[PDB]
Design a protein around this ligand. Sequence first.
Ligand SMILES: [Mg+2]
Ligand SMILES: [Mg+2]
Ligand SMILES: [Mg+2]
Ligand SMILES: [Mg+2]
Ligand SMILES: [Mg+2]
Ligand SMILES: [Mg+2]
Ligand SMILES: [Mg+2]
Ligand SMILES: [Mg+2]
Ligand SMILES: [Mg+2]
Ligand SMILES: [Mg+2]
Ligand SMILES: [Mg+2]
Ligand SMILES: [Mg+2]
Ligand SMILES: [Mg+2]
Ligand SMILES: [Mg+2]
Ligand SMILES: [Mg+2]
Ligand SMILES: [Mg+2]
Ligand SMILES: [Mg+2]
Ligand SMILES: [Mg+2]
Ligand SMILES: [Mg+2]
Ligand SMILES: [Mg+2]
Ligand SMILES: [Mg+2]
Ligand SMILES: [Mg+2]
Ligand SMILES: [Mg+2]
Ligand SMILES: [Mg+2]
Ligand SMILES: [Mg+2]
Ligand SMILES: [Mg+2]
Lengths: 102, 61, 89, 65
Amino acid sequence: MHIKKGDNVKVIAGKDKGKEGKVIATLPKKDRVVVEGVNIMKKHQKPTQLNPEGGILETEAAIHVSNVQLLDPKTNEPTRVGYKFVDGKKVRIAKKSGEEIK
Amino acid sequence: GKQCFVTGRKASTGNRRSHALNSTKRRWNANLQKVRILVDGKPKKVWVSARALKSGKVTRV
Amino acid sequence: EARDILKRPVITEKSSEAMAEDKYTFDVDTRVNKTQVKMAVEEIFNVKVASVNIMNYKPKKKRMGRYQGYTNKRRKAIVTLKEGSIDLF
Amino acid sequence: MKAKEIRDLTTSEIEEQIKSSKEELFNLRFQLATGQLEETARIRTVRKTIARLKTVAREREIEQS
RNA sequence: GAGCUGUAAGUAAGCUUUGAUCCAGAGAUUUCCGAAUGGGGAAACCCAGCAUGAGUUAUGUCAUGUUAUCGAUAUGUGAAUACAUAGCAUAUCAGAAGGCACACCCGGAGAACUGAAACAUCUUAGUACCCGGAGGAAGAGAAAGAAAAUUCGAUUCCCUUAGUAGCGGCGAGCGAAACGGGAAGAGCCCAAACCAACAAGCUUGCUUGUUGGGGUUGUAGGACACUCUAUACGGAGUUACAAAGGACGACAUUAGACGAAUCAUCUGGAAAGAUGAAUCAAAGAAGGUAAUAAUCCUGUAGUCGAAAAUGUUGUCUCUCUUGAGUGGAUCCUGAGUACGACGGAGCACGUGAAAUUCCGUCGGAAUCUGGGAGGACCAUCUCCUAAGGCUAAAUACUCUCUAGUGACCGAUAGUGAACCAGUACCGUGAGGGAAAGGUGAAAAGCACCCCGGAAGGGGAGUGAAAUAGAACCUGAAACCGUGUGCU
RNA sequence: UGAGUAGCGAAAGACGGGUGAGAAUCCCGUCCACCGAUUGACUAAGGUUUCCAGAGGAAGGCUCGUCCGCUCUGGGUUAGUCGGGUCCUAAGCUGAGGCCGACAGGCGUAGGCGAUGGAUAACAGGUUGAUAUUCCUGUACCACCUAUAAUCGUUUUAAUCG
RNA sequence: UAGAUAGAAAAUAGGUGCCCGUACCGCAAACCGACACAGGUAGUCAAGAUGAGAAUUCUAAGGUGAGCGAGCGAACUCUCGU
Ligand SMILES: [Mg+2]
Ligand SMILES: [Mg+2]
Ligand SMILES: [Mg+2]
Ligand SMILES: [Mg+2]
Ligand SMILES: [Mg+2]
Ligand SMILES: [Mg+2]
Ligand SMILES: [Mg+2]
Ligand SMILES: [Mg+2]
Ligand SMILES: [Mg+2]
Ligand SMILES: [Mg+2]
Ligand SMILES: [Mg+2]
Ligand SMILES: [Mg+2]
Ligand SMILES: [Mg+2]
Ligand SMILES: [Mg+2]
Ligand SMILES: [Mg+2]
Ligand SMILES: [Mg+2]
Ligand SMILES: [Mg+2]
Ligand SMILES: [Mg+2]
Ligand SMILES: [Mg+2]
Ligand SMILES: [Mg+2]
Ligand SMILES: [Mg+2]
Ligand SMILES: [Mg+2]
Ligand SMILES: [Mg+2]
Ligand SMILES: [Mg+2]
Ligand SMILES: [Mg+2]
Ligand SMILES: [Mg+2]
């Protein structure tokens, strides 16, 4: 996946459309990523469970990678990603500005 | 598994035909006669067709 | 091969009772004779073995969900020690 | 132990390490049987080292032949 | 190139940018049974010999290697029985075995129901089945051919000739071929005469056996005699034509890489939809993404890439190798063969006027002024030259792999099998042989409270929806209830 | 639908006390009854974990169920002498060479395999929830090995193997 | 006996002795009968009273009360007594 853990990405699709956050986790096999403050789910947790406290738990849920776009460093605008080989190393390049994403 | 040693003359299959042209399977057997002949320079009793023996082509010892 | 011969110790109520009588139970390789077991115990634990008693356990049917299968066949050896002791724990 | 380190070891050294590794594995198996082992991952780590030791030994023997 | 320790969740312990997991090439390990092969055996086990090694005071025990049969090739011993022949022992051999693709090929052996409105000839059919041998194809194949022209020039396959000519209780039915049009094309090597060498019979006559040379045919060719030409110059080649190799290059296959261009609003749980304004296109194939996306993702067009292995192929190298004439004295040119009779079979052709071709039995030629064929046979003419082999391609089929396609199926369909199916189950066995898909976008899979032993339920909460709560999309009918207007 | 119908598979139960959400049906006790050449005790086939303990009550059990040959979890089978093998052979099976046969294959010799028979050394007591001629206790036997050996022998042999 | 070869051992002491089966049912609810099925399943042991007896009847050792019950006490059917 072009999107990687720790990247800052705008959400371009879903309920959280127009929200920007760091990628907490990436699930390669599922083609899904976790973004902070995005796709929050309220999960019923038993106090009977190993955790002493029990109740509804709010955590981010995985979102499809296609619904997130990397933000251009210069303009802070969502951009498709390109790869250029520099000094024998492939580099992620923002299509909008041509800057190296990371 | 009986055949002429010299020529490989062997039984063949065909039909026995009645006057009404009824057909029954039959065999034609070679006239194989057990004879002592030299094999590998050593006398051996083997089955040979009378045709092969004819004209003294096969020496019997 | 001594390590290969003796797979593991057996810890059960009957086994523990035997341990009081200086008899030690080990699951062993299914192909080994009792003489091999005696020598293997002596090498590993540096003890003297009075006798080895051996028995075979058949594979046992076990069902998980809709899947039916068998446990592994087992060879169990009980080793009486003339001298020394084995500290399993 | 990775193959590179094993390759540095002499044939006798590998043989000694194979003996040592097997004893360690046996101890772990008895510990697991008695429920005394928490670090279960050690068992597999020892197994793969023994496999590596044997591989290097075999490679040498084939090279000799 | 950042996650990873399969399904398969979860827990635990861990691994990984000092490059995990993962993907491709190569290698290592690879228990036991099974042809199964040390012997035995009710497969997956039991019991040994020999050699070497481990252990033991020693015995017991253990490890490794080796030990089937048959064949072939050697070597040594060697009966009745003098010689020597069985026989016997030993060694060697990537020798054979066994399996499968329920296909295609060649061969052995070979039905019946059926049709003939019965049935026997005939048909079904040389089909099914069985068995043997294969090969990647097989078989066939360089005229003792087809013919009757101004002839053609191995074989195989397609079209056509034709449902013709024929065959046929002349019934049912069976059913060509040559010509002509095409696919593909390639031609070769022996036997013999004769020469040289070796060996045996010892005329030690020159007759045999072996090796090398020579020679290959119909326009008769060859030997033989003679005359030119040439020692690989040239030419040919591992697909026949003789048979192994080496070097370098190219291409292909087996992992991959880059790869254009969209935003806003409206509805909604969510936009890809609608609306408006843009953009790319050698890319508007396709799939996915919270509804229908050329521009969000994976891709596509296009372009690039291989350490290693394999295949194909080109050029060198390598290997092998003389090629033509003239002459008509003599010689050679495939024998128990051709052929005939009798009995069968095969030829579209059922014994017929039956050529052509095979088998069994018996008989049995000729030799270039020879022999065979042109559908009985004879003459004439014409065309060939049997009784020895080899030979690519065009043709057949698909267990399998890769890339695709469909006015093909869509869970009673489509494979028997969308699912842990040749399973469950059934049978002594051969064998027979099922049923069974769908929560949601996401597991967010109902904290907590209440009745109940539990099951199950009522709330609360999650969700767009729970009347989506687990064989959980939709939810017909039969069928079973509860209530109600009229009776 | 038939229909809350037929059936619920040879039999003697009763009561008390427990347990439990629930008891004709489970546990325990007393009395009663039934078999006793046997409904008792072994054991070969065959089956294959059904065995023991704790737990459970959906389904199975012709009712019920707190219970079970059911479900769940964890356990249980110990041999020089017993049965079999490392001994023997019968019928039979197989079968080097061999004989025969379209193929496949049939037959058969030497030799193998093959108990239902022959040979063959351990008994009594104790012990667990579940094994016992197997464990343990006591007292034995058999084969082999090592050492020390009364004695005997010491190459036509006269001790010894055969 | 043919053969083989210097060693043989009454005893004594010490030591070695493998594999497979072993649970449990087994005239049965666990085997063969689709069933927790009145059928079938080789062999061994088998007490007392009675008796010729392994018959008969009642008991022992040991095991069992049988996996629907409670009422009522019609016809009819079955099994049985008179
Ligand atoms: Mg074997
Ligand atoms: Mg008819
Ligand atoms: Mg008819
Ligand atoms: Mg061919
Ligand atoms: Mg060649
Ligand atoms: Mg793109
Ligand atoms: Mg939009
Ligand atoms: Mg004829
Ligand atoms: Mg004519
Ligand atoms: Mg359709
Ligand atoms: Mg449907
Ligand atoms: Mg189907
Ligand atoms: Mg089906
Ligand atoms: Mg009625
Ligand atoms: Mg009634
Ligand atoms: Mg009734
Ligand atoms: Mg009953
Ligand atoms: Mg009686
Ligand atoms: Mg029980
Ligand atoms: Mg019930
Ligand atoms: Mg036989
Ligand atoms: Mg044979
Ligand atoms: Mg017996
Ligand atoms: Mg018991
Ligand atoms: Mg028992
Ligand atoms: Mg009987």
